[PDB]
Design a protein around this ligand. Structure first.
Ligand code: AGS
Ligand code: AGS
Ligand code: AGS
Lengths: 570, 145
């Protein structure tokens, strides 16, 4: 009744509404739907964040400013609150006398009140249905595109009374103009200086890095949060910024989606040129693999990466034991500081056609639909990741197609329908396909010979549609004598750290490191023979003296050599 | 010949019982099949991503059909519609890219006959959807050799 004078036009009269910009064809349709004699009820429908509550706040800022037609001049936009009409309506028929007491004194103005039911689908609200049809209330609803479907589309006699005046998500060029007219609201709440580089590069950066939101709600937020970060650094304890710049926008996105465009200029760019030194600390050999990996991480940090495809999509073809999933563990240890920070997926677990429903999730109406699948879910959670599709050698095209879109255009949709973007991820696919051809025919193949053998899967798979998408087919060579002599003192260095925590300190001999480098050398089995020679020649002799109290903690366990048999003595 | 079906019918002067264009884009790899669906969607709607791109990701299954048309009534994903059906109810004039359509199950085409001739695909909820104004492109890789 008169507990409801909720005047959205006096909020616009007192300057308490944000200025709306450039939706002059959805307001012009909102106006002209509101000016017809039967069911003048527009419904600003559209995705969340798009700008459809802030069209009625641009009606209210045009009605109060006289940019409307002169039959709509001097109206009143009134935001009807569903919550305030149902609150306290405990007794029977209190809500109906409350709503009729609204409908009565909407009629007393004789059509000079434009009602605004924001979040229209909340209309307890059973009885407006005849008055909405005659044009007795001018009722701008503004519900989303999925909440109109599951409430108002269910009442098929109620969605007749409403004209959807669909509010499309604006472009980047329409969001920069939206943002150039809104920054004086955020330059004045935060007392900062949002510069025009921080607006062109906040509707650009959020329009590409953000996919879970709309368009006008992402760029506007970034600037809202970069300004509240600058005001934080203005206050808390020239050199300081009074000014939101385009680098401050990227810092707000770097810690919100993974990696910025601009935080690099100090010591991260030093350790990106030191990447092949940092990756060779754990993957010795395979310069052609470490260079092809580190170039793709440099191509993205320089902003040079194709923004539609992933950062890098590699196929790691080689023999066994040569470091194909050691590179992907040394890559994720480089950029995420943990080996188990890949989205690693052993491809050998899905040998069936039904096993492709665990990477994308079950379709609507099945078990495990509501849980997604752990490729698209683990990438929707953390969008900048490394995806290890380890041991990628299956005989099913249905499970391979999934990667037809991950690697080209960088998208892959849930069973739930949510499209997950892979354009910021590094997809690595380490199979074993040139194995008996890299070993024998090594030299001047230049990935043109083992790539025929990954091409020639086409009796089953590896369709040329798929190899055309992967960015680097990578040559992994077998390990030589000098390589496994240096994977020795990696796995040896990895063993003393397993013993300092026990409290035992080991010195290695210069021949004991030469025994494992000649006993654990096998050309066909890579570096796992050395990984087994250590756990057979120097760890089983250690454990019969670590258990048996023969080796006290603290004294230096000298790994001397007996008659070609490594002995642990203190 | 994709700017001839949108040229026959801008206001609509094609057959008004079948879509604006139904195209199979057959070819080798890397030739521009999916790029024509992003240069046409950029021409009509001023954005490459302004088409209904259904990759045939998980379309081989024995029921992925309910992914792009919707679950049956009373099932778990029922109230969220289907991917193809809701995107054309929401905007009837779109481009629909069906990427690598041969990599889908034959049960996918058995509901995709209804959009190609009748121009109208009923869904799992049970409402009929006008595809008579959309452009349905099916890129595929058959005949590549
Ligand atoms: N054309 C515009 N001009 C100025 N600000 C805009 C414009 N469109 C959107 N905004 C701003 O975008 C933000 C969110 O938009 P809203 O319209 O309030 O929410 P919405 O789009 O209605 O989505 P909801 O959550 O379903 S109400 C607000 O800060 C608005 O001021
Ligand atoms: N080039 C290398 N540099 C350092 N360690 C290596 C190298 N190659 C193998 N290793 C070691 O051997 C193991 C790695 O084997 P993986 O590389 O995971 O198997 P793969 O080489 O990828 O081939 P597979 O059997 O087809 S998975 C780990 O213990 C690594 O420490
Ligand atoms: N005719 C063309 N004109 C311009 N760019 C092209 C053309 N053909 C291919 N390209 C480029 O090649 C890339 C991949 O080609 P796409 O057309 O996307 O894939 P496709 O040609 O449809 O074939 P697939 O793998 O079977 S889906 C595109 O991103 C373009 O950059």
């Amino acid at each position: 009744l008169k507990k409801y004078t909720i005047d959205l036009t006096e909020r616009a009269e007192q300057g308490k509404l944000d200025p709306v910009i450039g939706r002059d064809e959805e307001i012009r349709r909102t106006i002209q739907v509101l000016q017809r004699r039967t069911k003048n009820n527009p419904v600003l429908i559209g995705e969340p964040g798009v700008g459809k509550t802030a069209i009625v706040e641009g009606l209210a800022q045009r009605i109060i400013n006289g940019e409307v037609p002169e039959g709509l001049k001097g109206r009143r936009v009134l935001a009807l609150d569903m919550g305030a009409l149902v609150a306290g309506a405990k007794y029977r028929g209190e809500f109906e006398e409350r709503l009729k007491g609204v409908l009565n004194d909407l009629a007393k103005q004789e059509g000079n009140v434009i009602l605004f039911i924001d979040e229209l689908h909340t209309m307890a609200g059973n009885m407006l249905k005849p008055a909405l049809a005659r044009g007795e209330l001018h009722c701008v609803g503004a519900t989303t595109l999925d909440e109109y479907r599951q409430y108002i589309e269910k009442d098929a006699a109620l969605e007749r009374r409403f004209q959807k005046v669909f509010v499309a998500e604006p472009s980047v060029e329409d969001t920069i103009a939206i943002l150039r007219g809104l920054k004086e609201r955020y330059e004045l709440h935060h007392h900062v200086q949002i510069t025009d580089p921080a607006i062109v590069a906040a509707a650009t950066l959020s329009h590409r890095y953000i996919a879970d939101r709309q368009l006008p709600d992402k760029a506007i937020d970034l600037i809202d949060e970069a300004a509240s970060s600058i005001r934080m650094q203005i206050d808390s304890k020239r050199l300081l910024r009074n000014k939101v710049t385009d680098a401050e926008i990227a810092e707000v996105l770097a810690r919100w989606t993974g990696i910025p465009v601009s935080r690099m200029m100090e010591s991260e760019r030093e350790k990106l040129l030191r990447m092949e030194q940092e990756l060779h600390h754990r993957v010795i050999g395979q310069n052609e693999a470490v260079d092809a990996v580190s170039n793709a991480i440099r191509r993205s940090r320089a902003g040079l990466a194709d923004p539609n495809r992933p950062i890098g999509s590699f196929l790691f073809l080689g023999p066994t034991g040569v470091g194909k999933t050691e590179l992907c563990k040394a890559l994720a240890n480089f950029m995420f500081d943990s080996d188990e920070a890949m989205v690693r997926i052993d491809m050998s677990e899905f040998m069936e056609k039904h096993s492709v429903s665990r990477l994308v999730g079950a379709p609507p109406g099945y078990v495990g639909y509501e849980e997604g699948g752990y490729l698209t879910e683990a990438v929707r959670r953390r969008p900048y990741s490394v995806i290890l599709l380890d041991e990628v050698e299956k005989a099913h095209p249905d499970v391979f197609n999934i990667l037809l879109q991950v690697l080209d255009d960088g998208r892959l949709t849930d069973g739930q329908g949510r499209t997950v973007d892979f354009r910021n991820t590094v997809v690595i696919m380490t199979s074993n396909l040139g194995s008996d051809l890299i070993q024998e025919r090594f030299g001047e193949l230049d990935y043109a010979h083992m790539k025929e053998l990954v091409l020639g899967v086409v009796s089953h798979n590896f369709r040329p549609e798929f190899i055309n998408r992967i960015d680097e087919v990578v040559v992994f060579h077998p390990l030589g004598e000098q390589h496994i002599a240096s994977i020795a003192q990696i796995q040896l260095k990895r063993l003393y750290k397993r013993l300092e925590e026990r409290g035992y300190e080991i010195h290695i001999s210069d021949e004991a490191l030469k025994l494992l480098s000649e006993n654990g050398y096998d050309p066909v089995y890579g570096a796992r023979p050395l990984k087994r020679a250590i756990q057979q020649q120097i760890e089983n002799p250690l454990a019969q003296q670590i258990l048996s109290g023969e080796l006290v903690p603290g004294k230096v366990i000298r790994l001397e050599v007996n008659e070609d048999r490594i002995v642990a003595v203190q």
